[PDB]
Amino acid sequence: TTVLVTGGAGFIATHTDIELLNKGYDVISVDNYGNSSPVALERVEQITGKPVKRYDGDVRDEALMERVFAENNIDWVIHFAGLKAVGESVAKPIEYYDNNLYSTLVLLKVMKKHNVKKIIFSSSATVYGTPKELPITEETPTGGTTNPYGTSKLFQEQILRDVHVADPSWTIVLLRYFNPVGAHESGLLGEDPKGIPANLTPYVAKVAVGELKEVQVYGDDYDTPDGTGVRDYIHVVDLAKGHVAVIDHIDKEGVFVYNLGTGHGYSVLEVIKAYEKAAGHPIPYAIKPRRPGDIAACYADASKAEKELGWKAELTIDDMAASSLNWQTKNPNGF
Amino acid sequence: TTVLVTGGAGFIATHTDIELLNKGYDVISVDNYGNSSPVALERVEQITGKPVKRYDGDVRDEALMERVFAENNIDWVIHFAGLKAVGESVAKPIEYYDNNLYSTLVLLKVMKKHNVKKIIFSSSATVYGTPKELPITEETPTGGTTNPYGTSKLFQEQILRDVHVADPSWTIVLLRYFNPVGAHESGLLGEDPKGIPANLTPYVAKVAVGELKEVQVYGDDYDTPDGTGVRDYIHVVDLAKGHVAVIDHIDKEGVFVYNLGTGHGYSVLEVIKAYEKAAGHPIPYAIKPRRPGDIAACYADASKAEKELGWKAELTIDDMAASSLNWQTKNPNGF
Numbered sequence: 001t002t003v004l005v006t007g008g009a010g011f012i013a014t015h016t017d018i019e020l021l022n023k024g025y026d027v028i029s030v031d032n033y034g035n036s037s038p039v040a041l042e043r044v045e046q047i048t049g050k051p052v053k054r055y056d057g058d059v060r061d062e063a064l065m066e067r068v069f070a071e072n073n074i075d076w077v078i079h080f081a082g083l084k085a086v087g088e089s090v091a092k093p094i095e096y097y098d099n100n101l102y103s104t105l106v107l108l109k110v111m112k113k114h115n116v117k118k119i120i121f122s123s124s125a126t127v128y129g130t131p132k133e134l135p136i137t138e139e140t141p142t143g144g145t146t147n148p149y150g151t152s153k154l155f156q157e158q159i160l161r162d163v164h165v166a167d168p169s170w171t172i173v174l175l176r177y178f179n180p181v182g183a184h185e186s187g188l189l190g191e192d193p194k195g196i197p198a199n200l201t202p203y204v205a206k207v208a209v210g211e212l213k214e215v216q217v218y219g220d221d222y223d224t225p226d227g228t229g230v231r232d233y234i235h236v237v238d239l240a241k242g243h244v245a246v247i248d249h250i251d252k253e254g255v256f257v258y259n260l261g262t263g264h265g266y267s268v269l270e271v272i273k274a275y276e277k278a279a280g281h282p283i284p285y286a287i288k289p290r291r292p293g294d295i296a297a298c299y300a301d302a303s304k305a306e307k308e309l310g311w312k313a314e315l316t317i318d319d320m321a322a323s324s325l326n327w328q329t330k331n332p333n334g335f
Numbered sequence: 336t337t338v339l340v341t342g343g344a345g346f347i348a349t350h351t352d353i354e355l356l357n358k359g360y361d362v363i364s365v366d367n368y369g370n371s372s373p374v375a376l377e378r379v380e381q382i383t384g385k386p387v388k389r390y391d392g393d394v395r396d397e398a399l400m401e402r403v404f405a406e407n408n409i410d411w412v413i414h415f416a417g418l419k420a421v422g423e424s425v426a427k428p429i430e431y432y433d434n435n436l437y438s439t440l441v442l443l444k445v446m447k448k449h450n451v452k453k454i455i456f457s458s459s460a461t462v463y464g465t466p467k468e469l470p471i472t473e474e475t476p477t478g479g480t481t482n483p484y485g486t487s488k489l490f491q492e493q494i495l496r497d498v499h500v501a502d503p504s505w506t507i508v509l510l511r512y513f514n515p516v517g518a519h520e521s522g523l524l525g526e527d528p529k530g531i532p533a534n535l536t537p538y539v540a541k542v543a544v545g546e547l548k549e550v551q552v553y554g555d556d557y558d559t560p561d562g563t564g565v566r567d568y569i570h571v572v573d574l575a576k577g578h579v580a581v582i583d584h585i586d587k588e589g590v591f592v593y594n595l596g597t598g599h600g601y602s603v604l605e606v607i608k609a610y611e612k613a614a615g616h617p618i619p620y621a622i623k624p625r626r627p628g629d630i631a632a633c634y635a636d637a638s639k640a641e642k643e644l645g646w647k648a649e650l651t652i653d654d655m656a657a658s659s660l661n662w663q664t665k666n667p668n669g670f
């Protein structure tokens with residue numbers, strides 16, 4: 001089984017690459033390195049002892065994607081390529097909608113042309129907007145998205161559903177990830193964005209090892225116990241294993257929806273404390289205004305994925321923090 | 336004032352071109368002729384005695400759209416370019432989403448680059464899905480769209496709203512048209528799709544003049560008085576005049592939403608009868624299965640547009656039928 005992984009050198013993709021390779025799948029990456037390094041793929045290869053076929057370019061480049069599909073026999077696609085910062089998406093909607101919607105459309109056009117009809121889409125808890133209920137299940141209504149990133153994810157889900165309506169020989173798996181954190185136990189690979197991290201834990205990790213000065217905590221006036229945002233953090237290795245479970249167990253036509261989270265919700269301050277326990281010292285933070293697009297609280301009921309895929313997130317917020325900190329200590333500037 | 340009209344040689348656009356030109360606006364067309372003829376623009380020029388600057392190509396071609404904006408000083412854009420058949424959209428979702436979403440995104444990218452920040456978007460009663468109430472007002476909730484075409488229109492509206500959030504110096508006018516029918520009184524111009532018409536009235540007109548054999552009536556088991564679909568038909572000349580009213584009266588920043596319809600609902604059989612009265616003979620029809628994506632009944636409350644734009648649709652279903660039939664009699668194969 002050959003798996004094309006778009007955004008193949010990113011955070012979640014590189015952890016997924018490892019887990020796929022370790023189970024005997026073949027892996028091809030396509031990435032433009034907007035938010036990652038090609039070096040991450042060397043580290044995948046080093047950890048696993050296995051190849052990643054590497055293509056360099058944009059998923060919106062039809063000629064490139066035609067070459068990828070012409071040169072390889074692809075069974076599954078995992079579509080990670082996208083821009084993903086909630087706050088940034090509010091200020092740059094067109095950049096988000098172009099990148100995120102059109103990457104998907106060029107991918108699907110080329111897939112259809114080669115009759116490759118099995119896709120895992122990297123969706124997001126953001127599709128639930130302000131959650132109609134907590135914890136969130138796959139029956140919780142979607143919509144009321146609060147930022148163009150989240151909107152783009154919900155739009156993409158609908159586009160994929162419409163593909164199956166027009167051709168029900170497709171297998172479409174919509175994986176709504178919560179908040180992945182952490183690093184591969186080896187410490188050879190972890191979260192390495194370009195520029196200042198837009199997400200919480202890489203920023204916290206960098207402050208803890210002295211690469212950044214101060215954790216910026218966006219809002220303390222949310223309707224949560226300590227007033228900061230509450231999120232379901234999941235170890236990126238558990239999230240990676242979920243992808244392998246999908247491909248191991250789903251070999252039928254249809255549209256399948258799964259929440260991938262832990263069910264445990266942590267506030268921003270509780271994440272900071274987890275890292276402080278891991279580091280053995282204070283991690284400086286400051287309360288700042290709310291970030292546009294942010295909601296108060298979201299966390300998952302992931303029991304559907306356990307039932308149908310045999311999959312559960314085992315790793316704890318301490319494992320997440322320790323592994324993150326191990327990676328960032330060994331690689332303070334990343335790659 | 337210079338107005339770029341994308342999809343500038345299509346049905347609604349050519350009627351709009353006339354009304355804009357007759358009020359002293361300058362008009363540029365960009366069109367790929369997927370569903371229209373370049374000859375329609377000669378007829379615009381002939382009716383008005385005024386020029387249309389003609390560009391030939393795809394709105395998704397960034398280099399073309401960059402040339403259009405570099406070569407002209409554009410004040411307003413009216414974005415008609417899209418694929419628009421409900422039933423077809425169900426079978427060809429990706430063609431619809433590519434054409435419709437990416438045309439809009441390339442347009443907006445180029446507009447932003449030249450600081451042209453006034454747009455009228457050709458939206459659609461389809462955004463209301465199965466209407467939560469009748470008649471439909473701009474307060475009726477959107478969503479529950481039943482076909483990728485309608486979905487694409489609702490997605491585009493949200494994208495445009497997100498542009499204004501990121502840059503509230505924009506003027507965005509979302510015009511939700513109901514069902515335009517008819518032709519310019521001259522009979523020199525009218526609805527001329529490529530291939531068999533996908534919409535009702537051009538097909539009815541062609542049957543009436545003997546160009547097609549039999550009106551295919553899609554479903555007679557809807558919850559409507561005669562069981563066929565019910566739509567708010569609006570004379571295309573009234574709809575064109577609505578666009579001029581927007582540009583005459585709206586010169587401020589913001590997002591503005593208007594339903595453009597008559598408030599009168601007609602069944603498919605009542606449309607056929609209107610044409611039979613206009614032709615003076617039976618127009619053969621046959622009851623066929625439901626078309627995928629179709630809803631039972633939609634019609635407009637357009638009083639918001641009357642209030643704010645001084646605009647109202649005056650022309651009746653008889654005017655629509657007579658003018659359609661006048662055009663199709665003089666031009667049985669169109670252009």
Ligand SMILES: NC(=O)c1ccc[n+]([C@@H]2O[C@H](COP(=O)([O-])OP(=O)(O)OC[C@H]3O[C@@H](n4cnc5c(N)ncnc54)[C@H](O)[C@@H]3O)[C@@H](O)[C@H]2O)c1
Pocket residue numbers: 006007008009010011012013030031032033034035036057058059060079080081082083084099103122123124125176177178179180
């Ligand atoms: N918390 C999370 O990190 C999270 C949660 C839910 C969903 N997701 C989704 O997961 C996917 C991956 O997230 P991630 O955290 O690994 O982010 P990431 O930035 O590390 O990974 C995305 C990769 O895609 C690449 N890329 C982006 N646009 C591209 C394009 N047009 N062509 C080619 N390459 C492109 C980037 O360079 C990057 O390596 C995204 O689609 C994101 O929305 C992420």
Ligand SMILES: NC(=O)c1ccc[n+]([C@@H]2O[C@H](COP(=O)([O-])OP(=O)(O)OC[C@H]3O[C@@H](n4cnc5c(N)ncnc54)[C@H](O)[C@@H]3O)[C@@H](O)[C@H]2O)c1
Pocket residue numbers: 341342343344345346347348365366367368369370371392393394395414415416417418419434438457458459460511512513514515
């Ligand atoms: N009942 C209606 O006809 C109706 C009602 C509501 C909304 N609308 C919207 O109005 C617009 C115009 O409708 P119309 O009835 O004039 O249809 P039309 O097909 O006559 O007009 C659209 C024009 O766009 C062109 N076009 C399409 N895609 C293009 C692209 N990518 N680049 C360049 N040209 C392109 C076609 O060749 C055509 O001339 C569409 O966006 C449609 O969804 C139509």
Ligand SMILES: CC(=O)N[C@H]1[C@@H](OP(=O)(O)OP(=O)(O)OC[C@H]2O[C@@H](n3ccc(=O)[nH]c3=O)[C@H](O)[C@@H]2O)O[C@H](CO)[C@@H](O)[C@@H]1O
Pocket residue numbers: 084085086123124125126177178179180198199200201203216217218219228229230231268291294
């Ligand atoms: C860039 C990124 O990885 N975004 C992902 C994250 O969303 P999400 O926006 O929740 O992720 P963040 O890591 O940016 O934010 C987590 C929490 O920390 C706060 N915060 C964040 C950064 C910071 O420097 N300071 C701070 O206080 C936020 O307000 C929020 O309450 O999970 C989603 C699924 O839920 C994914 O779809 C998003 O792609």
Ligand SMILES: CC(=O)N[C@H]1[C@@H](OP(=O)(O)OP(=O)(O)OC[C@H]2O[C@@H](n3ccc(=O)[nH]c3=O)[C@H](O)[C@@H]2O)O[C@H](CO)[C@@H](O)[C@@H]1O
Pocket residue numbers: 419420421458459460461512513514515533534535536538551552553554563564565566603626629
């Ligand atoms: C291709 C086209 O112009 N579609 C437009 C039309 O939708 P809409 O789908 O209503 O337009 P149609 O002209 O296709 O259908 C009108 C009615 O006639 C029926 N029918 C149609 C064709 C036919 O041959 N036989 C028949 O019975 C339909 O089932 C429907 O009840 O108005 C919408 C706004 O409301 C626009 O967004 C759509 O772009």
Ligand SMILES: [Mg+2]
Pocket residue numbers: 264265266
């Ligand atoms: Mg908790």
Ligand SMILES: [Mg+2]
Pocket residue numbers: 306307308309310
């Ligand atoms: Mg089980």
Ligand SMILES: [Mg+2]
Pocket residue numbers: 599600601
């Ligand atoms: Mg009526």
Ligand SMILES: [Mg+2]
Pocket residue numbers: 641642643644645
């Ligand atoms: Mg008034």
